mmCIF file of all heavy atoms in Angstrom:
data_model
loop_
_atom_site.group_PDB
_atom_site.id
_atom_site.type_symbol
_atom_site.label_atom_id
_atom_site.label_comp_id
_atom_site.label_asym_id
_atom_site.label_seq_id
_atom_site.Cartn_x
_atom_site.Cartn_y
_atom_site.Cartn_z
ATOM 1 N N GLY L 1 5.803 18.396 5.784
ATOM 2 C CA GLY L 1 4.695 17.687 6.423
ATOM 3 C C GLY L 1 5.067 17.181 7.811
ATOM 4 O O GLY L 1 4.242 17.295 8.713
ATOM 5 N N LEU L 2 6.242 16.672 7.976
ATOM 6 C CA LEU L 2 6.589 16.148 9.302
ATOM 7 C C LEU L 2 6.928 17.236 10.298
ATOM 8 O O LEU L 2 6.774 17.084 11.514
ATOM 9 C CB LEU L 2 7.693 15.080 9.212
ATOM 10 C CG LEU L 2 8.113 14.365 10.481
ATOM 11 C CD1 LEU L 2 7.125 13.267 10.788
ATOM 12 C CD2 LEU L 2 9.475 13.785 10.303
ATOM 13 N N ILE L 3 7.393 18.421 9.816
ATOM 14 C CA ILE L 3 7.467 19.595 10.693
ATOM 15 C C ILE L 3 6.080 19.972 11.187
ATOM 16 O O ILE L 3 5.879 20.245 12.370
ATOM 17 C CB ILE L 3 8.103 20.773 9.945
ATOM 18 C CG1 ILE L 3 9.619 20.634 9.810
ATOM 19 C CG2 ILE L 3 7.749 22.067 10.611
ATOM 20 C CD1 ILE L 3 10.279 20.770 11.118
ATOM 21 N N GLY L 4 5.104 19.962 10.280
ATOM 22 C CA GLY L 4 3.734 20.246 10.735
ATOM 23 C C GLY L 4 3.230 19.249 11.758
ATOM 24 O O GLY L 4 2.648 19.646 12.747
ATOM 25 N N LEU L 5 3.488 17.969 11.492
ATOM 26 C CA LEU L 5 3.056 16.957 12.460
ATOM 27 C C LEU L 5 3.738 17.158 13.813
ATOM 28 O O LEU L 5 3.064 17.088 14.887
ATOM 29 C CB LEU L 5 3.364 15.559 11.903
ATOM 30 C CG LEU L 5 2.243 14.868 11.143
ATOM 31 C CD1 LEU L 5 2.684 13.522 10.603
ATOM 32 C CD2 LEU L 5 1.044 14.703 12.074
ATOM 33 N N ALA L 6 5.065 17.382 13.815
ATOM 34 C CA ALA L 6 5.762 17.592 15.068
ATOM 35 C C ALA L 6 5.281 18.835 15.812
ATOM 36 O O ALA L 6 5.228 18.825 17.048
ATOM 37 C CB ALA L 6 7.262 17.693 14.791
ATOM 38 N N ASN L 7 4.896 19.872 15.039
ATOM 39 C CA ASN L 7 4.441 21.085 15.680
ATOM 40 C C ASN L 7 2.992 20.896 16.285
ATOM 41 O O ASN L 7 2.702 21.437 17.351
ATOM 42 C CB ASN L 7 4.415 22.225 14.674
ATOM 43 C CG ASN L 7 4.179 23.573 15.316
ATOM 44 O OD1 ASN L 7 3.984 23.698 16.514
ATOM 45 N ND2 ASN L 7 4.184 24.607 14.471
ATOM 46 N N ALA L 8 2.182 20.101 15.607
ATOM 47 C CA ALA L 8 0.790 19.944 16.036
ATOM 48 C C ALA L 8 0.641 19.194 17.366
ATOM 49 O O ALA L 8 -0.492 18.974 17.776
ATOM 50 C CB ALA L 8 -0.023 19.256 14.946
ATOM 51 N N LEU L 9 1.731 18.768 17.998
ATOM 52 C CA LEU L 9 1.640 18.049 19.258
ATOM 53 C C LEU L 9 2.428 18.700 20.385
ATOM 54 O O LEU L 9 2.584 18.084 21.463
ATOM 55 C CB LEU L 9 2.059 16.573 19.080
ATOM 56 C CG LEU L 9 1.215 15.724 18.158
ATOM 57 C CD1 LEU L 9 1.727 14.308 18.095
ATOM 58 C CD2 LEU L 9 -0.240 15.738 18.598
ATOM 59 N N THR L 10 2.923 19.918 20.176
ATOM 60 C CA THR L 10 3.464 20.665 21.286
ATOM 61 C C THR L 10 2.416 20.869 22.350
ATOM 62 O O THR L 10 1.213 21.089 22.016
ATOM 63 C CB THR L 10 4.005 22.023 20.783
ATOM 64 O OG1 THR L 10 4.803 21.801 19.594
ATOM 65 C CG2 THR L 10 4.870 22.654 21.871
ATOM 66 N N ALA L 11 2.816 20.836 23.621
ATOM 67 C CA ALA L 11 1.882 20.682 24.718
ATOM 68 C C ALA L 11 0.744 21.699 24.745
ATOM 69 O O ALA L 11 -0.427 21.276 24.908
ATOM 70 C CB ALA L 11 2.635 20.679 26.035
ATOM 71 N N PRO L 12 0.990 23.009 24.601
ATOM 72 C CA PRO L 12 -0.168 23.966 24.730
ATOM 73 C C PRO L 12 -1.223 23.738 23.676
ATOM 74 O O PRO L 12 -2.407 23.604 24.010
ATOM 75 C CB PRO L 12 0.540 25.310 24.591
ATOM 76 C CG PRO L 12 1.950 25.083 25.002
ATOM 77 C CD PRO L 12 2.254 23.727 24.463
ATOM 78 N N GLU L 13 -0.870 23.740 22.387
ATOM 79 C CA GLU L 13 -1.809 23.673 21.305
ATOM 80 C C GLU L 13 -1.979 22.236 20.740
ATOM 81 O O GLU L 13 -2.647 22.071 19.713
ATOM 82 C CB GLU L 13 -1.428 24.598 20.175
ATOM 83 C CG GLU L 13 -0.222 24.174 19.393
ATOM 84 C CD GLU L 13 0.131 25.083 18.263
ATOM 85 O OE1 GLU L 13 -0.541 26.124 18.123
ATOM 86 O OE2 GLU L 13 1.061 24.764 17.484
ATOM 87 N N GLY L 14 -1.375 21.242 21.390
ATOM 88 C CA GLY L 14 -1.286 19.937 20.774
ATOM 89 C C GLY L 14 -2.422 18.974 21.127
ATOM 90 O O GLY L 14 -3.603 19.298 21.003
ATOM 91 N N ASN L 15 -2.027 17.779 21.602
ATOM 92 C CA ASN L 15 -3.027 16.702 21.845
ATOM 93 C C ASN L 15 -2.581 15.931 23.080
ATOM 94 O O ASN L 15 -1.504 15.301 23.042
ATOM 95 C CB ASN L 15 -3.186 15.828 20.657
ATOM 96 C CG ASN L 15 -3.916 16.484 19.539
ATOM 97 O OD1 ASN L 15 -3.394 17.327 18.811
ATOM 98 N ND2 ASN L 15 -5.191 16.116 19.368
ATOM 99 N N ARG L 16 -3.360 15.976 24.130
ATOM 100 C CA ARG L 16 -3.200 15.044 25.227
ATOM 101 C C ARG L 16 -3.691 13.618 24.857
ATOM 102 O O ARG L 16 -3.444 12.685 25.601
ATOM 103 C CB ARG L 16 -3.909 15.518 26.481
ATOM 104 C CG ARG L 16 -3.163 16.588 27.256
ATOM 105 C CD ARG L 16 -3.518 17.970 26.752
ATOM 106 N NE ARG L 16 -4.939 18.273 26.958
ATOM 107 C CZ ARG L 16 -5.547 19.361 26.474
ATOM 108 N NH1 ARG L 16 -4.876 20.254 25.792
ATOM 109 N NH2 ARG L 16 -6.871 19.515 26.678
ATOM 110 N N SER L 17 -4.329 13.488 23.694
ATOM 111 C CA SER L 17 -5.041 12.284 23.370
ATOM 112 C C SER L 17 -4.119 11.191 22.820
ATOM 113 O O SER L 17 -4.179 10.033 23.269
ATOM 114 C CB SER L 17 -6.160 12.599 22.367
ATOM 115 O OG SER L 17 -5.630 12.818 21.087
ATOM 116 N N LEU L 18 -3.315 11.518 21.797
ATOM 117 C CA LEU L 18 -2.513 10.495 21.150
ATOM 118 C C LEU L 18 -1.561 9.821 22.116
ATOM 119 O O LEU L 18 -0.835 10.472 22.847
ATOM 120 C CB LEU L 18 -1.736 11.122 20.004
ATOM 121 C CG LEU L 18 -2.376 11.241 18.635
ATOM 122 C CD1 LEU L 18 -2.723 9.878 18.074
ATOM 123 C CD2 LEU L 18 -3.608 12.155 18.702
ATOM 124 N N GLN L 19 -1.584 8.481 22.110
ATOM 125 C CA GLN L 19 -0.665 7.679 22.902
ATOM 126 C C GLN L 19 0.379 6.961 22.075
ATOM 127 O O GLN L 19 1.448 6.642 22.627
ATOM 128 C CB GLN L 19 -1.443 6.633 23.730
ATOM 129 C CG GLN L 19 -2.359 7.204 24.797
ATOM 130 C CD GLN L 19 -2.952 6.159 25.671
ATOM 131 O OE1 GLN L 19 -2.654 4.938 25.494
ATOM 132 N NE2 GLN L 19 -3.807 6.551 26.591
ATOM 133 N N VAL L 20 0.095 6.710 20.788
ATOM 134 C CA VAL L 20 1.030 5.990 19.929
ATOM 135 C C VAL L 20 1.104 6.745 18.612
ATOM 136 O O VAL L 20 0.205 6.675 17.780
ATOM 137 C CB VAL L 20 0.573 4.520 19.685
ATOM 138 C CG1 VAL L 20 1.472 3.859 18.670
ATOM 139 C CG2 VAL L 20 0.612 3.742 21.001
ATOM 140 N N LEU L 21 2.211 7.471 18.414
ATOM 141 C CA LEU L 21 2.493 8.146 17.169
ATOM 142 C C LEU L 21 3.531 7.348 16.390
ATOM 143 O O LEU L 21 4.705 7.254 16.774
ATOM 144 C CB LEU L 21 3.000 9.543 17.427
ATOM 145 C CG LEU L 21 3.561 10.301 16.196
ATOM 146 C CD1 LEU L 21 2.397 10.664 15.245
ATOM 147 C CD2 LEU L 21 4.318 11.516 16.603
ATOM 148 N N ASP L 22 3.123 6.714 15.286
ATOM 149 C CA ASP L 22 4.011 5.876 14.488
ATOM 150 C C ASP L 22 4.287 6.585 13.195
ATOM 151 O O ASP L 22 3.445 6.645 12.275
ATOM 152 C CB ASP L 22 3.356 4.528 14.228
ATOM 153 C CG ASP L 22 4.372 3.474 13.769
ATOM 154 O OD1 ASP L 22 5.573 3.824 13.686
ATOM 155 O OD2 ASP L 22 3.968 2.355 13.468
ATOM 156 N N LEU L 23 5.540 7.097 13.058
ATOM 157 C CA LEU L 23 6.008 7.704 11.848
ATOM 158 C C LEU L 23 7.161 6.861 11.313
ATOM 159 O O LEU L 23 7.969 6.312 12.105
ATOM 160 C CB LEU L 23 6.422 9.151 12.005
ATOM 161 C CG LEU L 23 7.621 9.506 12.891
ATOM 162 C CD1 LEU L 23 8.930 9.557 12.104
ATOM 163 C CD2 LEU L 23 7.396 10.819 13.644
ATOM 164 N N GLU L 24 7.254 6.701 10.031
ATOM 165 C CA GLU L 24 8.274 5.904 9.380
ATOM 166 C C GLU L 24 8.501 6.405 7.976
ATOM 167 O O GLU L 24 7.628 7.056 7.385
ATOM 168 C CB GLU L 24 7.871 4.431 9.399
ATOM 169 C CG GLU L 24 8.922 3.466 8.800
ATOM 170 C CD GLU L 24 8.410 2.035 8.728
ATOM 171 O OE1 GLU L 24 7.299 1.772 9.224
ATOM 172 O OE2 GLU L 24 9.119 1.200 8.121
ATOM 173 N N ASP L 25 9.675 6.081 7.417
ATOM 174 C CA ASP L 25 10.014 6.443 6.033
ATOM 175 C C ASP L 25 9.894 7.955 5.817
ATOM 176 O O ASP L 25 9.419 8.429 4.790
ATOM 177 C CB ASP L 25 9.150 5.683 5.032
ATOM 178 C CG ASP L 25 9.531 5.884 3.606
ATOM 179 O OD1 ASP L 25 10.585 5.331 3.215
ATOM 180 O OD2 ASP L 25 8.806 6.585 2.889
ATOM 181 N N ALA L 26 10.301 8.710 6.817
ATOM 182 C CA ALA L 26 10.434 10.158 6.674
ATOM 183 C C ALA L 26 11.614 10.486 5.826
ATOM 184 O O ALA L 26 12.737 10.507 6.280
ATOM 185 C CB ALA L 26 10.472 10.864 8.036
ATOM 186 N N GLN L 27 11.407 10.724 4.527
ATOM 187 C CA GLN L 27 12.483 10.824 3.559
ATOM 188 C C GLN L 27 13.269 12.110 3.649
ATOM 189 O O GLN L 27 13.307 12.906 2.724
ATOM 190 C CB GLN L 27 11.931 10.603 2.155
ATOM 191 C CG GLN L 27 10.859 11.594 1.761
ATOM 192 C CD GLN L 27 10.395 11.348 0.342
ATOM 193 O OE1 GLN L 27 10.856 10.432 -0.331
ATOM 194 N NE2 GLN L 27 9.436 12.140 -0.121
ATOM 195 N N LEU L 28 13.960 12.326 4.781
ATOM 196 C CA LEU L 28 14.899 13.426 4.912
ATOM 197 C C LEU L 28 16.296 12.988 4.413
ATOM 198 O O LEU L 28 17.273 13.018 5.148
ATOM 199 C CB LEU L 28 14.952 13.946 6.330
ATOM 200 C CG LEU L 28 13.686 14.491 7.001
ATOM 201 C CD1 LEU L 28 12.846 13.368 7.579
ATOM 202 C CD2 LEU L 28 14.057 15.466 8.066
ATOM 203 N N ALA L 29 16.339 12.590 3.152
ATOM 204 C CA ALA L 29 17.591 12.211 2.533
ATOM 205 C C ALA L 29 18.605 13.340 2.557
ATOM 206 O O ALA L 29 19.785 13.137 2.838
ATOM 207 C CB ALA L 29 17.375 11.704 1.114
ATOM 208 N N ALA L 30 18.148 14.559 2.226
ATOM 209 C CA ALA L 30 18.993 15.716 2.364
ATOM 210 C C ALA L 30 19.302 15.972 3.829
ATOM 211 O O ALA L 30 18.487 15.606 4.703
ATOM 212 C CB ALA L 30 18.296 16.940 1.729
ATOM 213 N N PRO L 31 20.441 16.571 4.110
ATOM 214 C CA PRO L 31 20.773 16.829 5.523
ATOM 215 C C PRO L 31 19.884 17.921 6.141
ATOM 216 O O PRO L 31 20.294 19.058 6.330
ATOM 217 C CB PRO L 31 22.240 17.304 5.430
ATOM 218 C CG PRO L 31 22.742 16.781 4.188
ATOM 219 C CD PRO L 31 21.579 16.860 3.231
ATOM 220 N N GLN L 32 18.656 17.529 6.460
ATOM 221 C CA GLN L 32 17.661 18.446 6.999
ATOM 222 C C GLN L 32 17.656 18.333 8.506
ATOM 223 O O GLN L 32 17.185 17.351 9.083
ATOM 224 C CB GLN L 32 16.307 18.108 6.425
ATOM 225 C CG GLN L 32 16.211 18.278 4.934
ATOM 226 C CD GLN L 32 15.553 19.601 4.475
ATOM 227 O OE1 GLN L 32 14.600 20.022 5.141
ATOM 228 N NE2 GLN L 32 16.055 20.199 3.432
ATOM 229 N N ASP L 33 18.181 19.352 9.188
ATOM 230 C CA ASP L 33 18.487 19.314 10.589
ATOM 231 C C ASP L 33 17.481 20.083 11.467
ATOM 232 O O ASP L 33 17.782 20.400 12.593
ATOM 233 C CB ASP L 33 19.866 19.842 10.841
ATOM 234 C CG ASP L 33 20.958 18.956 10.267
ATOM 235 O OD1 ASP L 33 20.757 17.721 10.229
ATOM 236 O OD2 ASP L 33 22.021 19.478 9.886
ATOM 237 N N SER L 34 16.281 20.339 10.941
ATOM 238 C CA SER L 34 15.284 21.122 11.660
ATOM 239 C C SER L 34 14.092 20.278 12.119
ATOM 240 O O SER L 34 13.493 20.593 13.186
ATOM 241 C CB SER L 34 14.774 22.263 10.814
ATOM 242 O OG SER L 34 13.686 21.842 9.989
ATOM 243 N N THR L 35 13.742 19.250 11.363
ATOM 244 C CA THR L 35 12.637 18.397 11.811
ATOM 245 C C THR L 35 12.965 17.736 13.148
ATOM 246 O O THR L 35 12.063 17.582 13.990
ATOM 247 C CB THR L 35 12.391 17.330 10.766
ATOM 248 O OG1 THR L 35 12.313 17.934 9.449
ATOM 249 C CG2 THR L 35 11.100 16.626 11.035
ATOM 250 N N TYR L 36 14.212 17.371 13.364
ATOM 251 C CA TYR L 36 14.577 16.729 14.641
ATOM 252 C C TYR L 36 14.531 17.737 15.786
ATOM 253 O O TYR L 36 14.227 17.363 16.898
ATOM 254 C CB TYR L 36 15.937 16.070 14.536
ATOM 255 C CG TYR L 36 15.851 14.850 13.623
ATOM 256 C CD1 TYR L 36 16.623 14.789 12.438
ATOM 257 C CD2 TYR L 36 15.014 13.804 13.901
ATOM 258 C CE1 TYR L 36 16.558 13.692 11.620
ATOM 259 C CE2 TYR L 36 14.911 12.727 13.065
ATOM 260 C CZ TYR L 36 15.694 12.642 11.933
ATOM 261 O OH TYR L 36 15.637 11.542 11.139
ATOM 262 N N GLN L 37 14.820 19.032 15.485
ATOM 263 C CA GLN L 37 14.655 20.016 16.558
ATOM 264 C C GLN L 37 13.171 20.178 16.891
ATOM 265 O O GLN L 37 12.849 20.275 18.108
ATOM 266 C CB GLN L 37 15.220 21.354 16.090
ATOM 267 C CG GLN L 37 16.642 21.533 16.515
ATOM 268 C CD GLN L 37 17.318 22.661 15.694
ATOM 269 O OE1 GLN L 37 16.734 23.198 14.799
ATOM 270 N NE2 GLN L 37 18.555 22.940 16.025
ATOM 271 N N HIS L 38 12.295 20.181 15.929
ATOM 272 C CA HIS L 38 10.854 20.280 16.249
ATOM 273 C C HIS L 38 10.371 19.040 16.985
ATOM 274 O O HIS L 38 9.562 19.173 17.905
ATOM 275 C CB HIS L 38 10.030 20.502 14.963
ATOM 276 C CG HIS L 38 10.145 21.856 14.403
ATOM 277 N ND1 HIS L 38 9.214 22.412 13.590
ATOM 278 C CD2 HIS L 38 11.117 22.820 14.555
ATOM 279 C CE1 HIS L 38 9.587 23.626 13.227
ATOM 280 N NE2 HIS L 38 10.749 23.870 13.782
#
């Protein structure tokens, strides 16, 4: 889900609109090292 969210705001296909993106409790307890790249 948070990969999808991070992808949906890349500049070409994303949103110039959002000014405040508040994400919290992203449960990447496992060593998931790709969401931060996105």
Side-chain angles (χ1 to χ4, degrees):
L2 182 82
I3 283 291
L5 266 176
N7 190 0
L9 296 182
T10 314
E13 72 178 4
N15 286 77
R16 281 88 62 187
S17 74
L18 275 296
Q19 295 186 2
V20 173
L21 171 70
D22 195 3
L23 66 92
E24 182 187 352
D25 186 74
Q27 57 179 0
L28 301 83
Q32 297 260 321
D33 292 331
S34 88
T35 312
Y36 291 119
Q37 267 161 358
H38 287 203

